[PDB]
Design a protein around this motif. Structure first.
Motif, PDB file in Angstrom:
ATOM      1  N   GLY A  36       3.286   6.776   8.627  1.00  0.00           N
ATOM      2  CA  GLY A  36       3.794   5.705   9.461  1.00  0.00           C
ATOM      3  C   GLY A  36       3.143   4.351   9.227  1.00  0.00           C
ATOM      4  O   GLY A  36       2.911   3.948   8.091  1.00  0.00           O
ATOM      5  N   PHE A  37       2.833   3.651  10.311  1.00  0.00           N
ATOM      6  CA  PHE A  37       2.250   2.324  10.211  1.00  0.00           C
ATOM      7  C   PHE A  37       1.057   2.210   9.259  1.00  0.00           C
ATOM      8  O   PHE A  37       1.025   1.307   8.439  1.00  0.00           O
ATOM      9  N   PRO A  38       0.057   3.112   9.374  1.00  0.00           N
ATOM     10  CA  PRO A  38      -1.123   3.068   8.499  1.00  0.00           C
ATOM     11  C   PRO A  38      -0.713   3.034   7.030  1.00  0.00           C
ATOM     12  O   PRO A  38      -1.291   2.308   6.224  1.00  0.00           O
ATOM     13  N   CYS A  39       0.302   3.815   6.697  1.00  0.00           N
ATOM     14  CA  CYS A  39       0.823   3.866   5.334  1.00  0.00           C
ATOM     15  C   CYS A  39       1.422   2.506   4.986  1.00  0.00           C
ATOM     16  O   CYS A  39       1.138   1.943   3.928  1.00  0.00           O
ATOM     17  N   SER A  40       2.226   1.964   5.894  1.00  0.00           N
ATOM     18  CA  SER A  40       2.864   0.682   5.654  1.00  0.00           C
ATOM     19  C   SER A  40       1.867  -0.456   5.548  1.00  0.00           C
ATOM     20  O   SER A  40       2.124  -1.435   4.861  1.00  0.00           O
TER      21      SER A  40
END
Ligand SMILES: Cc1cc2nc3c(=O)[nH]c(=O)nc-3n(C[C@H](O)[C@H](O)[C@H](O)COP(=O)(O)OP(=O)(O)OC[C@H]3O[C@@H](n4cnc5c(N)ncnc54)[C@H](O)[C@@H]3O)c2cc1C
Length: 241
Positions: free
Chosen positions: A110-114
């Motif tokens: 999710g966000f961390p990846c993005s």
């Protein structure tokens, strides 16, 4: 079944959305160095984010609004009004949409990846050339706004240990790349690892074979080949709209 070799504009725009509406929104008041960090990061986005016309116009408008606020304290509610006035919901989106950062389960990726993707992209954009302010601005953002302090803490450990050795845009690109791999190593096979996306020393051989050396005498990575792959991977042409 997303293409691991591509970058999805959806992941990048969702990252921006999450940053402005969620992460920055955790603080009722933006002031001191946190506000400075926000302004430096937004300045970086306005200049280096690979956005479509509407998005780039939106970032420039937010950047300029921030630059005009002479005050030292900016209530988040006041910042939210500025985002709403500039139609960020129409320009970006109301809800996040992960494609290349889609976890097999809601709590995975999710966000961390993005955020990693966004960061790497910013360093590369700066190297295909202020530029020297990209990595410090990223460090500034992580320190003052990044949610999971667990995630943050590990990043700051690396910065003070060596981010000061980075003397060029290319070096900054490689610094973030190798620092990300050091994180990958600690997370590999951990209970928190998304089973569908195992951690590896990136880029794997199937993605970039030339990036890898063969002898156990020479370094693991071909730094020159790796730099080129990075410039190719995190480029506007490699983004799927
Ligand atoms: C500064 C920072 C610190 C973090 N620290 C922690 C921590 O201490 N503990 C914890 O549980 N979580 C931490 N996280 C979260 C974690 O790194 C991952 O983002 C998350 O676990 C999701 O992993 P992922 O497998 O989807 O891929 P991510 O690691 O999020 O990778 C995003 C993608 O970028 C690419 N990529 C992978 N490696 C590299 C690389 N070396 N260079 C360039 N591109 C790469 C791949 O295409 C991959 O799918 C941190 C994130 C950041 C941004």
């Amino acid at each position: 079944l997303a293409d691991r070799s591509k970058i999805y504009m959806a992941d990048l725009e969702s990252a921006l959305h999450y940053i402005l509406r969620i992460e920055v929104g955790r603080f009722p008041v933006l002031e001191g160095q946190r506000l400075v960090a926000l302004k430096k990061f937004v300045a970086v986005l306005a200049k280096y984010f690979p956005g479509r016309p509407l998005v780039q116009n939106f970032l420039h408008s937010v950047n300029e609004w921030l630059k005009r606020q002479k005050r030292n304290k900016i209530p988040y509610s006041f910042f939210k009004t500025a985002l709403d006035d500039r139609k960020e919901g129409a320009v970006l989106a109301k809800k996040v949409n992960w494609i290349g950062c889609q976890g097999s389960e809601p709590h995975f990726r999710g966000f961390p990846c993005s955020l990693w993707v966004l960061f790497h992209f910013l360093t590369v954009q700066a190297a295909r050339q202020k530029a020297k302010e990209v990595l410090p601005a990223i460090r500034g953002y992580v320190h003052y706004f990044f949610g999971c302090r667990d995630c943050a803490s590990h990043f700051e450990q690396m910065a003070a240990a060596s981010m000061h050795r980075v003397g060029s845009p290319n070096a900054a690109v490689l610094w973030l790349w190798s620092s990300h791999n050091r994180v990958n190593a600690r997370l590999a096979g951990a209970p928190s690892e998304d089973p569908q996306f195992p951690k590896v020393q990136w880029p794997p051989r199937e993605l970039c074979s030339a990036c890898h050396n063969e002898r156990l005498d020479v370094p693991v990575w071909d730094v020159e080949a790796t730099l080129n792959f990075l410039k190719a991977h995190f480029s506007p042409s490699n983004i799927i709209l």
